[PDB]
Amino acid sequence: LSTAILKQKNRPNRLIVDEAINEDNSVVSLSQPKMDELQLFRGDTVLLKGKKRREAVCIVLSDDTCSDEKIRMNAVVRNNLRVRLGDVISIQPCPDVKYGKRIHVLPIDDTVEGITGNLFEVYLKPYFLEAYRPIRKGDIFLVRGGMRAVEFKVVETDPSPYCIVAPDTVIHCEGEPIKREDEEESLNEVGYDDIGGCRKQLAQIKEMVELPLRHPALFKAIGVKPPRGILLYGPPGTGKTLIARAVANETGAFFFLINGPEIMSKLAGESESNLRKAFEEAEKNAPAIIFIDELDAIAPKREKTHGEVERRIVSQLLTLMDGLKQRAHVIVMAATNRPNSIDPALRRFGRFDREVDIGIPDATGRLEILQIHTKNMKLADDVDLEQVANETHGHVGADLAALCSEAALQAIRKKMDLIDLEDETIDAEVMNSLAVTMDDFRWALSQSNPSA
Amino acid sequence: LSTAILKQKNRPNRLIVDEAINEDNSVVSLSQPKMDELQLFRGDTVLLKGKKRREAVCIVLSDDTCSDEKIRMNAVVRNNLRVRLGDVISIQPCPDVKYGKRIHVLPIDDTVEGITGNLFEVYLKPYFLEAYRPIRKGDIFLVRGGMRAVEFKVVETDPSPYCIVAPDTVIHCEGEPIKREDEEESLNEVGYDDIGGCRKQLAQIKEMVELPLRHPALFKAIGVKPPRGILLYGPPGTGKTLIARAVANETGAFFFLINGPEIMSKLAGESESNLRKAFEEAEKNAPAIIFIDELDAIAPKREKTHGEVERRIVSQLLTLMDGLKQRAHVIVMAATNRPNSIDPALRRFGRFDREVDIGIPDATGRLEILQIHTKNMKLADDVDLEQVANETHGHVGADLAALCSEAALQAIRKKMDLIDLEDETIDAEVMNSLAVTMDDFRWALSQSNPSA
Ligand SMILES: Nc1ncnc2c1ncn2[C@@H]1O[C@H](COP(=O)(O)OP(=O)(O)OP(O)(O)=S)[C@@H](O)[C@H]1O
Numbered sequence: 001l002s003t004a005i006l007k008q009k010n011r012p013n014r015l016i017v018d019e020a021i022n023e024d025n026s027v028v029s030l031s032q033p034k035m036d037e038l039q040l041f042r043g044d045t046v047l048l049k050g051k052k053r054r055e056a057v058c059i060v061l062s063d064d065t066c067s068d069e070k071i072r073m074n075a076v077v078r079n080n081l082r083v084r085l086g087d088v089i090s091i092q093p094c095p096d097v098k099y100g101k102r103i104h105v106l107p108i109d110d111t112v113e114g115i116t117g118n119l120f121e122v123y124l125k126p127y128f129l130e131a132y133r134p135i136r137k138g139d140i141f142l143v144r145g146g147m148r149a150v151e152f153k154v155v156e157t158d159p160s161p162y163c164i165v166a167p168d169t170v171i172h173c174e175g176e177p178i179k180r181e182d183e184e185e186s187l188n189e190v191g192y193d194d195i196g197g198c199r200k201q202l203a204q205i206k207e208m209v210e211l212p213l214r215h216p217a218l219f220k221a222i223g224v225k226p227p228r229g230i231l232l233y234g235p236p237g238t239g240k241t242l243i244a245r246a247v248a249n250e251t252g253a254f255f256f257l258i259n260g261p262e263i264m265s266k267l268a269g270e271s272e273s274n275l276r277k278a279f280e281e282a283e284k285n286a287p288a289i290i291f292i293d294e295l296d297a298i299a300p301k302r303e304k305t306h307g308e309v310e311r312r313i314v315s316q317l318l319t320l321m322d323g324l325k326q327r328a329h330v331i332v333m334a335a336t337n338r339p340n341s342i343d344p345a346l347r348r349f350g351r352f353d354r355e356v357d358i359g360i361p362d363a364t365g366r367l368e369i370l371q372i373h374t375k376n377m378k379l380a381d382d383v384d385l386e387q388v389a390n391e392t393h394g395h396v397g398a399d400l401a402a403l404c405s406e407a408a409l410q411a412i413r414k415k416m417d418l419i420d421l422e423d424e425t426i427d428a429e430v431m432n433s434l435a436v437t438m439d440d441f442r443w444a445l446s447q448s449n450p451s452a
Numbered sequence: 453l454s455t456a457i458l459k460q461k462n463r464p465n466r467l468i469v470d471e472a473i474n475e476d477n478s479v480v481s482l483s484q485p486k487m488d489e490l491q492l493f494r495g496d497t498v499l500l501k502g503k504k505r506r507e508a509v510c511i512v513l514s515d516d517t518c519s520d521e522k523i524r525m526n527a528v529v530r531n532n533l534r535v536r537l538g539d540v541i542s543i544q545p546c547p548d549v550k551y552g553k554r555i556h557v558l559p560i561d562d563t564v565e566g567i568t569g570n571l572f573e574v575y576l577k578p579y580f581l582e583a584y585r586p587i588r589k590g591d592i593f594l595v596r597g598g599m600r601a602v603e604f605k606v607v608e609t610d611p612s613p614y615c616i617v618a619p620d621t622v623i624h625c626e627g628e629p630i631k632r633e634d635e636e637e638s639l640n641e642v643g644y645d646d647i648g649g650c651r652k653q654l655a656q657i658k659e660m661v662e663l664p665l666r667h668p669a670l671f672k673a674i675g676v677k678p679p680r681g682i683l684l685y686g687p688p689g690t691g692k693t694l695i696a697r698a699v700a701n702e703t704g705a706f707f708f709l710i711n712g713p714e715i716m717s718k719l720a721g722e723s724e725s726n727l728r729k730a731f732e733e734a735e736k737n738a739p740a741i742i743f744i745d746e747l748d749a750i751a752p753k754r755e756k757t758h759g760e761v762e763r764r765i766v767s768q769l770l771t772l773m774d775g776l777k778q779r780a781h782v783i784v785m786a787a788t789n790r791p792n793s794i795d796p797a798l799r800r801f802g803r804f805d806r807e808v809d810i811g812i813p814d815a816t817g818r819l820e821i822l823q824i825h826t827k828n829m830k831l832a833d834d835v836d837l838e839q840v841a842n843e844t845h846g847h848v849g850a851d852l853a854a855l856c857s858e859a860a861l862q863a864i865r866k867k868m869d870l871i872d873l874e875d876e877t878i879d880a881e882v883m884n885s886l887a888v889t890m891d892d893f894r895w896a897l898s899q900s901n902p903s904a
């Protein structure tokens with residue numbers, strides 16, 4: 001009804017991700033009656049749009065065993081699009097792909113220990129030879145070579161984000177092996193799926209921020225000026241910074257983060273200048289989001305603030321808020337856990353004149369949050385998260401994250417007999433049997449707290 | 453149950469330290485059925501792991517009079533491993549010891565007064581000649597030469613921390629005699645055994661700090677993010693700083709101390725820069741512990757703080773806390789006796805989101821504390837510490853330390869007839885008879901105080 005901005009919306013090209021029968025990294029499969037509909041011939045380079053900004057460029061081929069409303073893609077493409085099997089993706093015609101002449105690829109450290117020989121010769125040359133492969137910047141692809149398979153990241157391309165790897169292309173692979181930990185931080189960058197119990201608030205954010213930015217026509221046509229300052233407020237640990245991360249990763253807009261304490265940490269004037277820089281940067285990068293996390297740090301009530309520099313910074317901000325003309329296409333978001341400690345002038349019409357209440361999650365909220373927190377956890381057959389959701393009345397998402405963390409530590413405490421701190425590494429078998437039982441959660445629950 | 457992380461755990465190589473029959477510094481003895489089990493042949497150079505980070509390298513030989521679950525080692529090796537007889541040690545196969553070509557050894561000043569002659573010629577050369585001795589950097593070893601025995605410290609070695617002293621090795625011994633007081637300060641560096649009444653809290657510290665740092669595989673495998681800010685709190689003199697010292701000396705992690713007043717003593721900006729430096733240093737030295745002692749000095753409630761520089765520092769800290777990415781492998785520890793006077797933003801999720809309560813000790817705690825405080829004290833036959841533990845309900849560790857100090861001063865007061873302040877030194881006999889009686893404790897007890 002109001003949640004309408006979030007509805008899936010059936011389209012010709014919106015397709016469910018199915019497992020590939022064509023196991024090659026550069027290839028996606030569609031049914032023959034689906035290829036006809038989208039006017040995609042055999043062998044055409046296509047653009048795929050996954051979750052959290054992520055894209056892949058692939059060749060499209062027909063498949064009989066594939067369904068009409070499905071798309072067949074292997075683990076590697078699915079990984080690049082940040083999608084599990086049975087997620088919706090956009091398939092888009094992509095005939096504008098120039099042949100690249102310089103690509104920079106790097107291996108991943110843990111997939112490359114022992115005998116270098118020559119990485120390009122053993123792995124990359126047979127992977128690209130006459131293949132005319134489409135690849136995007138930031139693609140992590142796997143290659144097999146005798147003994148084992150090595151993962152590579154596309155660090156740099158010749159045309160801007162994507163190119164066809166012709167026999168012309170110089171494939172540079174000199175450099176530092178990409179640390180596995182970097183790409184784990186990248187896979188586990190926060191998106192809208194990582195934020196739970198905030199469905200109606202997320203709808204609000206897309207309405208107030210995403211919609212006026214990526215569709216300013218609506219507002220101009222309907223004769224209405226889009227709101228330009230959105231303040232997220234709520235109790236400690238409710239998801240504001242998480243939403244800030246999710247928005248940063250999921251928007252079409254250029255995004256600029258300002259941390260409250262980050263600003264206040266810097267020298268007198270050198271902080272006013274960083275604020276100035278942020279607003280000018282956002283203005284410069286046409287459609288933009290400025291997120292001021294912990295706004296209360298930078299904009300407290302000009303009465304209850306003793307320092308002149310501090311009083312000056314509130315004035316510096318207000319000026320910038322009012323400084324953005326209509327045709328700037330910059331929405332400013334901010335987050336606080338003490339909204340009533342922000343100078344009221346900032347909360348007036350034209351400034352942060354819209355509020356999103358990221359409040360305490362209900363029983364259904366808590367369930368969502370526990371499901372998001374355990375998606376990477378090994379859980380036992382007997383673990384009932386609905387039971388946990390129900391036993392946690394006072395809990396915000398931060399409390400639940402901590403709750404899941406403690407139940408896991410308890411599962412570790414149970415496995416302390418076969419583990420010792422003095423050992424160099426932990427026994428192989430011991431690591432696999434690690435499952436967080438319901439009994440672990442009941443311990444975590446017994447120890448649990450609200451921020452009371 | 454929860455104390456599980458601390459449990460000794462029986463292992464093939466975990467062995468009880470027994471007095472040596474082979475009196476040589478380079479040699480440890482095991483029983484024949486123990487040598488078979490660990491696949492250690494006669495003469496093999498081994499790696500021994502004691503308490504408080506300490507190691508020793510020795511040659512292993514069979515012994516008949518030695519038990520299976522016991523290891524025979526002399527006073528010197530026991531000293532180097534910082535163990536008294538009947539402590540558990542790790543013995544490790546060590547076939548990777550290259551012959552050293554330069555060692556720097558220095559004598560200890562109090563074992564070297566009068567006639568130098570030549571230290572290398574009289575002591576070192578007969579000690580190492582054709583002996584193929586394993587030695588570690590920091591080893592304090594004793595050598596006998598005619599008139600008396602001299603103590604030597606291994607200051608520097610040729611391969612990194614340990615080498616075999618072949619006839620190739622240049623034995624440098626030029627330089628300042630090592631001060632005895634330095635090596636007393638090193639022997640009496642604080643460890644986990646020096647902290648009593650904190651068993652469950654010590655378990656917590658190893659869980660939250662040692663375990664994630666020296667075994668981050670578990671947390672990744674279980675799909676759980678390790679906590680990254682641990683705050684120890686409790687009343688004045690409970691043993692927070694002591695724990696900080698113990699952790700500093702006992703961890704495998706790099707350890708950076710920050711004292712609160714230390715920081716706030718330094719010029720405006722020059723303190724922000726010192727905080728900066730501490731975090732960059734920890735980040736640089738891969739797996740690290742930052743200890744912020746007396747946090748309340750640097751992070752008070754941004755409201756109840758008048759100084760702009762002081763307000764700026766809290767902001768500088770928060771920034772750094774949030775600034776460490778997941779792949780940093782840096783846990784920040786902090787201590788305070790006023791946890792409620794710290795800015796709550798610091799005590800939020802992701803910051804100091806974990807609390808260790810170093811509280812008042814129970815009866816059994818006080819007994820532990822008194823046993824630690826009197827381990828170097830001359831006590832009378834009639835001194836019953838269980839009696840002292842029970843008479844001290846209000847007392848924390850600092851109170852008990854002072855109680856032991858006052859009991860000792862009372863023993864000195866009883867000996868005031870044969871002592872005079874005007875004398876150049878105290879009579880020899882008078883010094884030896886100095887024993888602290890139970891009557892001394894009852895005087896100390898009578899005068900005693902909590903911090904009420
Ligand atoms: N609604 C939620 N859904 C999923 N995870 C959540 C939610 N709320 C909190 N979490 C988890 O708790 C952590 C902390 O939440 P944050 O977004 O940092 O808190 P916050 O709302 O910014 O609170 P303040 O005001 O900074 S204390 C996140 O990293 C998530 O892992």
Ligand SMILES: Nc1ncnc2c1ncn2[C@@H]1O[C@H](COP(=O)(O)OP(=O)(O)OP(O)(O)=S)[C@@H](O)[C@H]1O
Pocket residue numbers: 646647648649650687688689690691692693694695788789821824848849850851853
């Ligand atoms: N739990 C303990 N076990 C053994 N000795 C202790 C213990 N607590 C205190 N002590 C002794 O008392 C002295 C003072 O303790 P500290 O660790 O400095 O106190 P603290 O807990 O840091 O208190 P604050 O907050 O600085 S007043 C130490 O040097 C120890 O000798």
Ligand SMILES: [Mg+2]
Pocket residue numbers: 240241242335
């Ligand atoms: Mg936040």
Ligand SMILES: [Mg+2]
Pocket residue numbers: 692693694
């Ligand atoms: Mg202290």
